[PDB]
Amino acid sequence: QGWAARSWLPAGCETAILFPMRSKKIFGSVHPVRPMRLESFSACIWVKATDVLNKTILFSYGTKRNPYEIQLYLSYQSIVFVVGGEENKLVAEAMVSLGRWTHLCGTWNSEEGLTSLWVNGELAATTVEMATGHIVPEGGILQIGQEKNGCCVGGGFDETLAFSGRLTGFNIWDSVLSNEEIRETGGAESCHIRGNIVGWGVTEIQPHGGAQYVS
Amino acid sequence: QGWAARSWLPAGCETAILFPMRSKKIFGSVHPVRPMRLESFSACIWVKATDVLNKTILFSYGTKRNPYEIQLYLSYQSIVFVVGGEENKLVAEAMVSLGRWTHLCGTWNSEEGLTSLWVNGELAATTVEMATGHIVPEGGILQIGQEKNGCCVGGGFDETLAFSGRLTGFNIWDSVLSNEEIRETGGAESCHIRGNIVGWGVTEIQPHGGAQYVS
Amino acid sequence: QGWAARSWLPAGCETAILFPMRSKKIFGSVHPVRPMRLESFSACIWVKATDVLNKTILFSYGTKRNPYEIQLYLSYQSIVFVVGGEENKLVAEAMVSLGRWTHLCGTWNSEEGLTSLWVNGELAATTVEMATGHIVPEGGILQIGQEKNGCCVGGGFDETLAFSGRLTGFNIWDSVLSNEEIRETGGAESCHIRGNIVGWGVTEIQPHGGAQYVS
Amino acid sequence: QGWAARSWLPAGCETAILFPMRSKKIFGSVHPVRPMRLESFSACIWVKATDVLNKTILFSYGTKRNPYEIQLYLSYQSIVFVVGGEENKLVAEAMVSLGRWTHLCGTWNSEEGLTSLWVNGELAATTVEMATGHIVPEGGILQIGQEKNGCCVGGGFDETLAFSGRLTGFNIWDSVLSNEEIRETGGAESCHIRGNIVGWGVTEIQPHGGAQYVS
Amino acid sequence: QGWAARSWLPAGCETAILFPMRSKKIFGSVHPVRPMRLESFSACIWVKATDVLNKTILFSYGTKRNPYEIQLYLSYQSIVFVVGGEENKLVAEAMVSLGRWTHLCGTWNSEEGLTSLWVNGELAATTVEMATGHIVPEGGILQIGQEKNGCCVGGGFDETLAFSGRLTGFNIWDSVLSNEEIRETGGAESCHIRGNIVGWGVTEIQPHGGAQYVS
Amino acid sequence: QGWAARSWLPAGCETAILFPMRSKKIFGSVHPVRPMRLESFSACIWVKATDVLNKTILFSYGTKRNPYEIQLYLSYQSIVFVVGGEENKLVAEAMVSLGRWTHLCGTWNSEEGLTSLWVNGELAATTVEMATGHIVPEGGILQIGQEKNGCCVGGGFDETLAFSGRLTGFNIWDSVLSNEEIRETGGAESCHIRGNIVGWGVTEIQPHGGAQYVS
Amino acid sequence: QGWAARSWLPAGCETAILFPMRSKKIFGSVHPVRPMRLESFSACIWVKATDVLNKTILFSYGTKRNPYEIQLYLSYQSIVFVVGGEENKLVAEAMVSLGRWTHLCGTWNSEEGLTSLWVNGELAATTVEMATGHIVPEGGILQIGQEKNGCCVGGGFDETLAFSGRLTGFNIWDSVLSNEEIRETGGAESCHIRGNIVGWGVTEIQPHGGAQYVS
Amino acid sequence: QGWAARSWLPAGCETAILFPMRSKKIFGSVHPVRPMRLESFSACIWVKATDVLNKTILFSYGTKRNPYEIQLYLSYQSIVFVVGGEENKLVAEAMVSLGRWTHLCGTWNSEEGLTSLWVNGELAATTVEMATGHIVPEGGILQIGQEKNGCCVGGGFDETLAFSGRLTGFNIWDSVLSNEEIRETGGAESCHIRGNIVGWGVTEIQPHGGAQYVS
C-alpha cells in the first residue's frame, strides 16, 4: 500500500512531471500548436505541491512586452489567478494543502472580465471586470513551474518562484467550460478529457533543468 | 489496482515505448538486420493510442523514391493499411478505441495482391489485387509513430502525423502468417513470439525526440 | 510483496538517490540557497548502505583551506561524525547494518562544542568540547556520498571513500533540534519535515557520475 | 501480479541491467579496482535471456593479445565456458531456457585446469586439464553482454554476438568457491553475497549503447 | 606565397565550408527563410573539388515524393545540372579541374524549359524544353555536398555521392539572371552579390558530419 | 594583399566574433560582472555588417518589464540608438556601409536626457531630453547581434532582427566619455582601451547558435 | 617569415592533423571504404614529430587476433616498420629529426616478404623474407598516432605510445609503388597524389581526444 | 604586418592557449604523467596578459590540505611567486607590460629555501629561506589561468582571479635550471626545450570554460 499510495496519480493519468527541487534552471516549456490568442479560456491542472513560498508558479504565459498575460500560482495556502497583468488578480484564500493531489481550474472571459477559480470542482473564487476587453495575444512563451525570465544561463530564473512537487493533466481550452464540464475535468476518470489549446499527452511539454517525466 | 492497471502491458511483454506527445521531432527508428526486400509480409503491433487525428502513423516504411512502401496508420475511427503506394489502401472502418491496448496486425502477399487486416485476432478487413506483383524494396527507412520526412534538421516531421500513446510488440515476418498464428501473436502470453524481420526485444529500436522506453 | 519491499522508501518519502556503485566519479552535489555559515546545526539523513569500507562518506562539507568542516561517514559497523576538523571526531560504535533503511542525524553547537549522534531516533553517542567556539564557514562545497577531491576532470575522487546504496531525506537545520523533534524526523510520516538550510525535495541536489534519482 | 511478475528480480536484488535489443553498439563495461590477474576464479551471474543465437555473450574478459581469456556465453539451449582460449571450452548441453531468470556460475583453477559449470546451484558440467598452468593476465577489458572487439568505431561490435534480456548479480571471486558457497550465491536472499574482484552494486558497471539500469 | 595560395578564397569572400573527406554523414544543410517554390531560378556556387567520382553532389534540392527537384553535381571533368527529375539533365563537358577554384552557375526557366549552365562566367552548355511548365515545389530539403537520403540514422548517406573539397558563395535567385549579371557574380570582388532565395553569409547553412566553416 | 585584408581587424584587436548568418538562434550573450544600473553610459563597438535590413541589432539590453532599455541597431544606411524605450530614439541618417569596419559609440546622460551618436570618431547625431531622469535598471539580459526574445524553445528569436557579419571591441563605460576619449576609443591602436562595465577581452561573451570567436 | 614558417605545410597540402599532446585518449581513426585485405601495399605519410620516445606510433593496423598487422612508428631517431607481427620488423637507423616535416613511406610485398622503407624519397632500409606469404586481413581497426588498445571508457590507450606533433598526407596503396612513384609522392606539389585504399582528403579520418584538424 | 604582428608567437612556438575573458568557469587543467613530488623545481611560461587585477593566476598547484603549494600570479605591476603557502611570497615589483609577450621563470630549492624569479631571462628577484625543508606533495591538481577550487558548481572559480590573454610554453623541470639554461628557455627558438615534469606540447593540457587552443 505504501508504494501504491505514493505512486498514485489522480485521474486515470499515467504520466506526471516531477519537479525534484526548486532551482534557478528547473522549468517546463509548453508548445501549443495553435496560437495562444484568447478572448476567453479555461486552464486546469493537477498539482501536488511539495512546498509553497510567497509565490510558486504553477504555469505562466507571457509576452515580450508583458510577462504576466496569464498566471496561476500558489501563495502559501492561497491560490492566485492573474490575467492581463499583475494588477488583475483573483485570490482564493485558503485552498491548497501540501503533499496531496488537488485539481485547479482557472476560467476567464474578456467580454465582462468575468473570472472564476475552482478547486477540486468547487467554486473557490469569482470576480468580474478583470481585464475587461483585453485580448491575450499569440506569440508568447508558455511555461509550467516557472515564470518567464530566462532559461539561457547567466543566472537563470528566480529560484524562489519555482514549483517543486508533481504536475499532471495541464489543459487549456480556448473557451469557458460550463460548470458541469469543470466538475468533469476533475473526475476520477477525467484524464482523457483534454484541452483544445493545450492537451495533456498531445501538446509537446519539455521538462528542463532537472524536471522529469515520471511515466 | 489502478496503479497496477495504469502500468499493465498487454501480452507478457515487459517493455513498451511511450510517446508522451505528438511533436515535430518525436519518432522511433527501427534497424532490421536483414533486408526489408519483401514479396509477402506480416506486420503486427500493440498500440494504446492517446489521441487520433486524420492520420496518425503507427509504423511506416519508405524509400527515397517512394515514401509509402508500407504504412499502418489510424484515422479517427479506422485502421488504414498501405502497401506499395498511398493509392493502395485497405481500410478497416470502425475498431480502434482510445486508451485501450489493442493488437493490430497486417498481412500482404504480392502474388495476388492479397491483403488482410486483423484487430484483436479477428479478421477486420480483406482485399485482393492490392499492389499485385509489387516487391517492397530494401534500403528504406523504417520508423514507428512517424512517417519519413525531415529528420536531422530542427523538427522536420509533420506534427499532425505523429503517434501519441504507447507501443509494444512491433513484429514483422517475411511471410504471410497463417490465421492460427495470427491469433497466437495476440495471445495472453504471446510476447515471446517475434518476427524474423523485426523482432520486438531483438531488433534495434531507437526512440527519438522525447519517445521513451518504459522498461 | 518482495517487489513492493525492494521499492519501499522509509518515511512518506517518494524519491531517493541511488548510488549503483562506488567509483572515482559518482557523487551528489548539494546547493543550499542560504549560506552554510553555522554556529550550530542538525543534519539528518536516511541511508541504505550497500557496502561499507574503512570510510564511506554519507555527506561532506568543506572549503579550500579545510576539507572537513562537517562530515558524516560510516566505518564498517560504526558511524563517525566530524565537525571543524578530522581531529574533532565523535564515533558511534556499532550502529549501521547493510541493506536496511536507517535514519542518522547529527547535532552540534559551537557554544560548548556539544555534539550528539542519533540512530533511528535513539541517542547513539554524545560528547562535549568538540570544536568549541568554531564557526563553520560559508562558500564551501557540500556533497553527498563523496568528499571534496574530484569534480572537473581526471576521475578525481577516491573510489574507496564513495558511498554505494540509496539515500533520501537529507536535511540540515541551522539549529540544534530538540530531542522530541529528532524523534519526529525519523517518524513513519516525517518526510514533510525538512531543514531550513538543506530541505529534501526543495534544495537543489544534482546526482553525478552514475548517481540517479529514483522516483 | 501482472506487473509484479514482470518486475520481479531473482534474489534480493534491487537493480538489473536491461539489454532492450542486440545491436552493434550495446554493451556493458566493468571496471574492477583490483587487477584481474587470476590463478583461479569463480564467476556467477543471473541472466534472463530474451533470445539466444549461435553465440550470445554473457560476459567476456580479453586482452590485446588474446580476446578470449575468459568467456561465458549461451549457444541456443547450451552454456559454454571458456578460459585461456577458444580451444579451452566446457559445454553444458541443454541448460538455459528463454525468459526465465537462471543463475550461472563458472569456476576454474589453473593448478589442475579443473573447471566446473553450475546452473541454479546444480553442477551442470565439469572438466579437468583446461588451461592447466595458465594465468589470466591483468590489464584486459571486461565486458558484459558483448565481446571485446569493436567499440568507438560507431559501435563496431558484432551484433550477432550481443546479449539481449536482463542481467543482475554479476560477481567474480579470485578463488574457487566451495560447493556450499556456490549454492548460497544462488539463494533466494543471496544478492548481498558479492565477489571480491567484481561485486554487484560495488564495482563500477557502465551500460552503453542503449543498455539501461533498471532500478 | 605558398601559405597565401593555400588560404586564398576566390572572390572577396572571407568564409568557406571545408569538406575534409567524403563519408556517410558529412553534409551541409541550407535553410531558406522564404519558400523554394520556383518557376525560374539561378543557382551559382564556388567549388574547389578535391576528388570527383561518377557523381559528386555540389547541392541538391528534393522533396519527399521527388528527391531530384534540383541538382548540380560533377561527373569527373563533366558538370551535370538537373531540374524536375533525374531524366532532365543539362550536361557540360570537360569543365571542372580538381584543386582549382571555379565558379559554376545554373539557370532555368519553366516557361520554355530554357536551361543554361555557366563556368567561370562563360556559357558552357544550354538546352531548351527541359522540365517545361514544371514548378519546383516548396517544403523540400536543400543540402550542399550531399543528396537527400537518410541523415538521422547513423551515417545513412551514400558516401560515394558526397563532396570533398571547399565551397563558398552558394547563391540562389528566384529569377533568371541576365548574362551580364552572371558574369558579375563570378567577378573578382563579386562575393557581396548574393541571392534573394539563398544568400551566402545570410542564409543559415549548417555543416554536419565533419564539415567545417574555415572562416 | 587580399589574404591579409580579408583577415584584418580594425584596431590592435586580435579577436572578433563572426556571425556567419542571421538565423533564428544565433546571438551573443554578455555577462557584466558589475550591475548594469546606469544613470549615464557610453557604449562603443566595431561592426563589419554583411547585410542590413529594416532593423539589425548590434547590441540590446532589456529587462523582463522592458525589452528596450538600450539598443543600438542598423536600419539600411542608418544607425538607431535607443534608451529607455522604443519611443526614445536617436537616428543617424546615412553612414553605415556594408563590408567595412566602422566604429560606433552611443553616449547618454539621464540628467538632461542628453544623447549623442558617433561614427568613426565624428559626431553623427545628437539630442537633448531623451529618457530624461530615467535610470537603466540592473538585472537585465545584455545580448550582441540579437534582441531579447528567447533562446531555448528551438531558438525562438526573430531571424529578421539578427546581425550578420563580424563584431569586435564591444565596450560599455558607466560614464559619458569626453569627446577626446571617444576619438581615442576609435584610434588605430585603441583596442587596449576597454570599458569598466563591459570590457572587450575581460567581460565574458558567449557566442551561441553558430556565432564563433575568430581568434 | 616565422609566422609563415610556423604554419607551412609540406607538399601542396591544405589540411593537417595536430596532436597537441600525447595523452591516454588522443588518436585518429581511419575508415577505408574498401577492405584492408592486402597482399602488398605502400603506406606513405608526412610527419612533424614534437617529441619521440622509445615507441611513438605514426599509424597502426590490427585485428582482435593480432594488434600488429601493420605498424609504422618512431624510436628516437630510428624508424620502425612492422608487418604481420612485432617479430617482423624493418628498422631504419637514424632518420627522423624533431620539428621538421619529413616524408616517410613504407612498402611491402608478401610474395617474397620484400619490404622497403623510404625517407624524404631516399631508400632508407630494405629487407626480404619479412612476413612471406602472409596476407593482411580485413575487418581490422586502422588508427593514426596511436596503437590498437582500449578506447571506450576503458582508461584509454598507453600514453607513452601516443604521437605528438602534426600529420598530413596519410596514404595507402593496395600495391607496391615503383621507385619513381615513391619519389613523386614526396614531391613539392605531390599532395594531390593519394592512395586507393586510404586517400588523404577523401578517406574519413576522425580526430579524437584533443586531436584537431588544423584547417 | 598588422596580422603578422598580432598572430606572432614568441619562441618557435606554434600553439598557444587563448583566454578570451575572465569568468567563473574558464581555466586550463594540466596532467603530468609523473608525480609532482618536488624538492626543487623550475617553472617557466610565456604570458601575454590582457588585463591584470590584484591577483591574476598564471598557474597554480594545490592539494586538498593546501591550495597554495605553488603559485605564479601577476598583480597590477608585479609578479608574485608562491611556494608552500601564501605566506611564502617572492615579489618582483614592476615588470609585466600588458599586451606584450614576456617570459617568466620561477626557481625554488627546498634545501636552503633558495628561490629566484626571472623575467625575460634577467634575474628579477631572489630570496632565501623560503619554505626551507618543505616538500611539494604528490597528487595535487595543477591548473593554468585559475586557482584551485572545484569547477562544477555552475562555475565555482573566483572570476576576479582568472587569467585573460594568451599563454604558451608552460614548462616545469624537477630541478633548478642553471642561469645559462634559464636564458636559453627564453631564447628566440627555445620552444623545443621543454620541462621533464610538464613539457609544452607533450603534457596533456585541457582548456575549459571557453579557453581555446590557438594552433
Ligand SMILES: *[C@@H]1O[C@H](CO)[C@@H](O)[C@H](O)[C@H]1NC(C)=O
Ligand atoms: C507575499 O507576496 C506579496 C506580493 O503580492 C508581498 O507583498 C509580500 O511581501 C509577501 N509576503 C511575505 C510574508 O513576504
Ligand SMILES: *[C@@H]1O[C@H](CO)[C@@H](O)[C@H](O)[C@H]1NC(C)=O
Ligand atoms: C481525413 O483524411 C482524408 C484523407 O483520406 C481527407 O481527405 C479529409 O480531409 C480528412 N478529414 C478531415 C476532417 O480533415
Ligand SMILES: *[C@@H]1O[C@H](CO)[C@@H](O)[C@H](O)[C@H]1NC(C)=O
Ligand atoms: C580504518 O581507518 C583508520 C583511520 O581512522 C585507519 O587507521 C585504519 O588503517 C583503517 N582500518 C583498516 C583495517 O584498514
Ligand SMILES: *[C@@H]1O[C@H](CO)[C@@H](O)[C@H](O)[C@H]1NC(C)=O
Ligand atoms: C554454432 O557455432 C559453431 C561454432 O562453435 C559453428 O560451427 C556453427 O556453424 C553454429 N551453428 C549454426 C547452426 O550456425
Ligand SMILES: *[C@@H]1O[C@H](CO)[C@@H](O)[C@H](O)[C@H]1NC(C)=O
Ligand atoms: C556513371 O553513371 C552513369 C549513369 O548516369 C552510367 O551510365 C555509367 O556507366 C557510370 N560509370 C561508371 C564508371 O560508374
Ligand SMILES: *[C@@H]1O[C@H](CO)[C@@H](O)[C@H](O)[C@H]1NC(C)=O
Ligand atoms: C523600417 O522601419 C520603420 C520603423 O521605424 C518602419 O516604419 C518601416 O515600415 C520599415 N521600412 C520598410 C521598407 O519596411
Ligand SMILES: *[C@@H]1O[C@H](CO)[C@@H](O)[C@H](O)[C@H]1NC(C)=O
Ligand atoms: C626500447 O625498446 C626495446 C624493445 O624494442 C627494448 O629492448 C629497450 O629496453 C628499450 N629502450 C629503452 C631505453 O627503454
Ligand SMILES: *[C@@H]1O[C@H](CO)[C@@H](O)[C@H](O)[C@H]1NC(C)=O
Ligand atoms: C592587492 O593585494 C594585496 C595582497 O598582498 C592586498 O594587500 C591589497 O589590498 C590589494 N590591493 C588593492 C588595491 O585592493
